[PDB]
Amino acid sequence: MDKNELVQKAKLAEQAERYDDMAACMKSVTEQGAELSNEERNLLSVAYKNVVGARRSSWRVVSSIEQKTEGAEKKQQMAREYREKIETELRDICNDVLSLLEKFLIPNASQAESKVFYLKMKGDYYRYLAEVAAGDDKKGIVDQSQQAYQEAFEISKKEMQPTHPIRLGLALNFSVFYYEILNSPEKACSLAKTAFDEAIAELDSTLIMQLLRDNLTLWTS
Amino acid sequence: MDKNELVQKAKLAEQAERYDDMAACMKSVTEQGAELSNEERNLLSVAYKNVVGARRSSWRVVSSIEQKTEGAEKKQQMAREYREKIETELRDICNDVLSLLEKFLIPNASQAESKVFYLKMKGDYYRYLAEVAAGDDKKGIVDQSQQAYQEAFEISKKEMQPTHPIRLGLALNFSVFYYEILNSPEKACSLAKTAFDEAIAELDTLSEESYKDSTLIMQLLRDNLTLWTS
Amino acid sequence: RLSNV
Amino acid sequence: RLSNVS
């Protein structure tokens, strides 16, 4: 019922590795309509990271099997329907998050830090939705991902230090979206090099900067 | 909705680390009335090991936080309530498995091996129930565990080599029960030692099929034999 | 305690 | 691949 009560549930759930619970708590905190603290916002994001991450992982697995059973048609059909089950949960979860972002988190964001963080989340979960979308639906959804990432990118260029982990985090994913969703290794690389370039100036974060480098070696090699 | 399809899903789900689904699949297979094959049996028991195992581990953590917030009474109340939620899950799950055991799996067991396996499973899910049982309800459930363990023990003694991994696992879990549920460290240790010694003395009988699992269990036996009499 | 997994 | 935490 109460916000402090729900925040504590969420932490307890996290300790228990029960993330459905963790997410639902933090859903209810969001739906109370006030702007989340940094603590609360990281709870939310961790919770759905895990909730969504488990399906993305499972999907990958069953999708590998669907492919590797071409020729064995009944087996492939079994894998395909099961993938479809996973995709339904994956859509429920994306729509949940995206809806919280539309109704609560993005409207209430009063600071640059949080508006960027939440627009990135939106980029992220539109990306996730897109990855299991069909046909024309896919195309529009990929666009909504581009836009949320771009907007966050523009706000972050203007309002945040180049070393800020939310701003480097944005650059990682946005560049990974350029590679993985739009097949632009030239746009991916440029973006990632530019963020690394501008962070390195004001060091006088490392993990994300390292991750940028890592991804860079993969794309070109 | 036919049997082979359920078994296929269950493995898919096992691949995807989605054990609620794996459970549900094997549940439906079981509800179809026929004796499970060895594969089916193992899928079922693997499915529910994971479903039940998650909750028991979540309970360990939340219980531990409850104890450690004595004096922070609101914090503790919070953890207690969440533990109760977990305990309700534990109960549906145990009562699902115990119901499958009573209605299908134990009546349909035609070979002694599968009777032991299923009687031991029953001891187990009775053990799990008892860990979250209250008062007088608890006393009853504990006997139920002991009875199903004991019955499995007597068939195993009659019908299975000491190196059989079902017999060994039965001995492990029974000795654990004696120690953790009946607080008999002596009874636990003697049963553990006999199981292990008798497996060693008839190492000749350990098949290449059974080798990996028997040895794993024998390790767990001797490991437990250590930290009980430290 | 260590039981079968 | 490689995006942010875990």
Residue numbers in the entry:
A (entry chain B): 4 to 207, 217 to 233
B (entry chain A): 4 to 233
C (entry chain F): 2 to 6
D (entry chain E): 2 to 7
How does the study describe this entry?
Microtubule associated protein 2 (MAP2) interacts with the regulatory protein 14‐3‐3ζ in a cAMP‐dependent protein kinase (PKA) phosphorylation dependent manner. Using selective phosphorylation, calorimetry, nuclear magnetic resonance, chemical crosslinking, and X‐ray crystallography, we characterized interactions of 14‐3‐3ζ with various binding regions of MAP2c.
Although PKA phosphorylation increases the affinity of MAP2c for 14‐3‐3ζ in the proline rich region and C‐terminal domain, unphosphorylated MAP2c also binds the dimeric 14‐3‐3ζ via its microtubule binding domain and variable central domain.
